[PDB]
Amino acid sequence: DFLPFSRPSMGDAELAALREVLQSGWITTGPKNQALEEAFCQLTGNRHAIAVSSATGGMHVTLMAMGIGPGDEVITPSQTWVSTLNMICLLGATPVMIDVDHDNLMITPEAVEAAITSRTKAIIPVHYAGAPADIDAIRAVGERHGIPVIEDAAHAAGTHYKGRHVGWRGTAIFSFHAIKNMTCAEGGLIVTDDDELASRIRSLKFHGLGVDPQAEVITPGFKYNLADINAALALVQLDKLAQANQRRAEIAQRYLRELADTPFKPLTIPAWDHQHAWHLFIIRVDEAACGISRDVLMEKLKAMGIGTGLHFRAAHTQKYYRERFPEVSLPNTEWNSARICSIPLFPDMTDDDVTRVITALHQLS
Amino acid sequence: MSDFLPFSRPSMGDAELAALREVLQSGWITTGPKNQALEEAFCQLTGNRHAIAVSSATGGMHVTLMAMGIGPGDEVITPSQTWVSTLNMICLLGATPVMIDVDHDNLMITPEAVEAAITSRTKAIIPVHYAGAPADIDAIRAVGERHGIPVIEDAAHAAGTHYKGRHVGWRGTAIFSFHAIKNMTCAEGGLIVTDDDELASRIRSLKFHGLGVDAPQAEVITPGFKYNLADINAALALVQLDKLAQANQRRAEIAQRYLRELADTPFKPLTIPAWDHQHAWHLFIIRVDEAACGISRDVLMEKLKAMGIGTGLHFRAAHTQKYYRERFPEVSLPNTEWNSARICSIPLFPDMTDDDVTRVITALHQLS
Numbered sequence A: 001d002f003l004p005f006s007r008p009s010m011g012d013a014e015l016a017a018l019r020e021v022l023q024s025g026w027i028t029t030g031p032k033n034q035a036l037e038e039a040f041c042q043l044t045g046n047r048h049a050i051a052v053s054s055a056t057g058g059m060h061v062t063l064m065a066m067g068i069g070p071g072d073e074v075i076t077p078s079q080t081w082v083s084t085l086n087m088i089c090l091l092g093a094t095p096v097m098i099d100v101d102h103d104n105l106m107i108t109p110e111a112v113e114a115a116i117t118s119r120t121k122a123i124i125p126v127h128y129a130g131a132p133a134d135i136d137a138i139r140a141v142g143e144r145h146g147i148p149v150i151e152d153a154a155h156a157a158g159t160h161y162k163g164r165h166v167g168w169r170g171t172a173i174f175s176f177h178a179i180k181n182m183t184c185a186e187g188g189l190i191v192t193d194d195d196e197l198a199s200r201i202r203s204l205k206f207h208g209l210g211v212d213p214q215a216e217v218i219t220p221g222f223k224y225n226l227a228d229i230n231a232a233l234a235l236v237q238l239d240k241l242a243q244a245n246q247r248r249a250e251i252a253q254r255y256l257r258e259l260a261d262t263p264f265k266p267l268t269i270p271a272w273d274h275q276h277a278w279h280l281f282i283i284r285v286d287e288a289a290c291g292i293s294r295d296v297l298m299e300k301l302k303a304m305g306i307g308t309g310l311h312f313r314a315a316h317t318q319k320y321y322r323e324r325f326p327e328v329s330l331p332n333t334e335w336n337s338a339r340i341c342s343i344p345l346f347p348d349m350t351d352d353d354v355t356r357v358i359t360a361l362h363q364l365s
Numbered sequence B: 001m002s003d004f005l006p007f008s009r010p011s012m013g014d015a016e017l018a019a020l021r022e023v024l025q026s027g028w029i030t031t032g033p034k035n036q037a038l039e040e041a042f043c044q045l046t047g048n049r050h051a052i053a054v055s056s057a058t059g060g061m062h063v064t065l066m067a068m069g070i071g072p073g074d075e076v077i078t079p080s081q082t083w084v085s086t087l088n089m090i091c092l093l094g095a096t097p098v099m100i101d102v103d104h105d106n107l108m109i110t111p112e113a114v115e116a117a118i119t120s121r122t123k124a125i126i127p128v129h130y131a132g133a134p135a136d137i138d139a140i141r142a143v144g145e146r147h148g149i150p151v152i153e154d155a156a157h158a159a160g161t162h163y164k165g166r167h168v169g170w171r172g173t174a175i176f177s178f179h180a181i182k183n184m185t186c187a188e189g190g191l192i193v194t195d196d197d198e199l200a201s202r203i204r205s206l207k208f209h210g211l212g213v214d215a216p217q218a219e220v221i222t223p224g225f226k227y228n229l230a231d232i233n234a235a236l237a238l239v240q241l242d243k244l245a246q247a248n249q250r251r252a253e254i255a256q257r258y259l260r261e262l263a264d265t266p267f268k269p270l271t272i273p274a275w276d277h278q279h280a281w282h283l284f285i286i287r288v289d290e291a292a293c294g295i296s297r298d299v300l301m302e303k304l305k306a307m308g309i310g311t312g313l314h315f316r317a318a319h320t321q322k323y324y325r326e327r328f329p330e331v332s333l334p335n336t337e338w339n340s341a342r343i344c345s346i347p348l349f350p351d352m353t354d355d356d357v358t359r360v361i362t363a364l365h366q367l368s
């Protein structure tokens, strides 16, 4: 009877796809990877798609292929998952953590521009919770200074910005982790319009192998390829994505309406034209307004059989980054990081599941 | 295409599909109870203390060397006669691979070659258990102990390999692979066993973002990577581990027939080690010397393919590949170079029929 904050929608279609792969005998990277990549080119309109074993690995090889390393700075929010900051550091580069908008939790072009230095080699905006960042404005800052923008689109499968899917141009990295809007348990995919970057990425995610003749190691690379077992699941889930996101939107709209007369504060919907994917439904819990703290709300909801998530504890408040970058002070991030939680949002939720959550929040206010 | 006999094919059937159904129905599809069961199963299989499932043996090597503190200024002794993943991971941690030769007939490093290559900078030794036979790991370990240098075993080929009556990795540290051509597979995956408590603790953190508990809630203690194994894959690996004994018994039957029926051909299998062992028979490798066989290795592979018979090359020595050839042009490894130019792997997988085996043997006799 526990209602988790997320659960995948796996059924007979996924099992039938798995049966096909197993029957074929070709279970690692093969035709299903190619079909998934072609499908994401059709979805986004971008040129190149590279399937990978996780969005974290995708970020690792994308930054590596761009040549980012010691002496380089990478602008990123602290208000994101730690994978991006970790990959910057593990390439020897320096994350430059910037604040986010206090109500949609995404970086602004002004904050990006203020943080640019002669060392900046990449800017990594996050499309947060299913809404897009103001990517044209961020891209314009990058273009003015000759700095590439790499989009963290983990939350943005099915997100549109000014009438196009996220990643229609430039470079973006999607996630297929279990709680994402389409999942193959673990997986990811990079889209890019940059031919050379795409060529480097494909080699660096598969041992650095390339043709100088037979394939051989051109420069050392990692192992981040996606098996066809997983790619086949992702194809089924992509086929379901439009309907899944429609259901998520219906649930989120009901949360927006029925929590309007509670002190719990959702994120604000951006003013630029978009279609929200509704990956997460985040609320801010301020004890002064709500009569209950964020941590206690999570605990009491759990005691009522209702799961919640924390997306995310800001990276700069975590031990490694807190001690390496003690000077970082990001007020909007710090205020929200202490007050946000994610309430249940997934397309297998019934109307009664949603009513249960809303009733509990009303009771706990 | 339907009549092509590849050099390997997985054995995936209703049992694997039923395991996948269970995980999907549960809704818990990434790392969870199937990972824990797989790890416990490998602790029971090997007798070792700690088992850490990972997304690939390459990733496992990456985080194991990282957890050991391997980095700039450190040397790591390894064969060139192995898969390039190990050399790459050494280099991508900033460390220096020190490539040594292998025995000319079993393609595994010797304690003497390891000892000769040790310097004050050596921080690890990585023997490879090749094709399903174990390296002489007690002798290699003794060299490491004498100099205080850890030995990390590449056991990708050695699921089901025994050495002096124990499974590979019963002590020390070893890394298994569950890639599609390995004797048990979940398409992509691997697993580290270790008897070192601190190393295991570091590895578990470093394969999942560096998360740990401060001296409280989990937080990044130091940056780590993402190399966890999904439960969908762990569930497949559990079925395949349950099948492993019978799969390896069939592989041994096939390999024994190759050993017998190629004995009167000029093709030269690897030699069986003199130390007590049980061979897993991951690969059946033959040496193709044009003087003895009347045909070259490359041409044999091409002609076998024209006959609908697949082969593999395990492996083109790392030091002969562009990056390593140009970075380490001074490396000269005679046994490795001789074999690398002459080896290929003929079909060996447990779903092969007796008639499939006869087809391979007949073609090799015809092409001699």
Ligand SMILES: *Cc1c(COP(=O)(O)O)cnc(C)c1O
Residues within 6 Å of the ligand: A054, A055, A056, A057, A080, A081, A083, A084, A126, A152, A154, A155, A174, A175, A176, A177, A187, A188, B226
């Ligand atoms: C979890 C997540 C990632 C990493 O994705 P994986 O596929 O799990 O590696 C990156 N960015 C954001 C915003 C995420 O939520």
Ligand SMILES: *Cc1c(COP(=O)(O)O)cnc(C)c1O
Residues within 6 Å of the ligand: A223, B056, B057, B058, B059, B082, B083, B085, B086, B128, B154, B156, B157, B177, B178, B179, B188, B189, B190
């Ligand atoms: C393939 C292989 C590896 C790497 O295993 P993955 O699971 O593919 O990362 C390591 N060592 C040897 C000897 C191999 O054949």
Ligand SMILES: [Mg+2]
Residues within 6 Å of the ligand: A259, A260, A261, A262, A263, A264, A265, A266
């Ligand atoms: Mg409200």
Ligand SMILES: [Mg+2]
Residues within 6 Å of the ligand: B262, B263, B264, B265, B266, B267, B268, B269
């Ligand atoms: Mg012979």
Ligand code: NA
Residues within 6 Å of the ligand: A158, A245, A246, A249, A275, A276, A277, A278
């Ligand atoms: Na939507």
Ligand code: NA
Residues within 6 Å of the ligand: B160, B248, B249, B252, B278, B279, B280, B281
């Ligand atoms: Na055997």
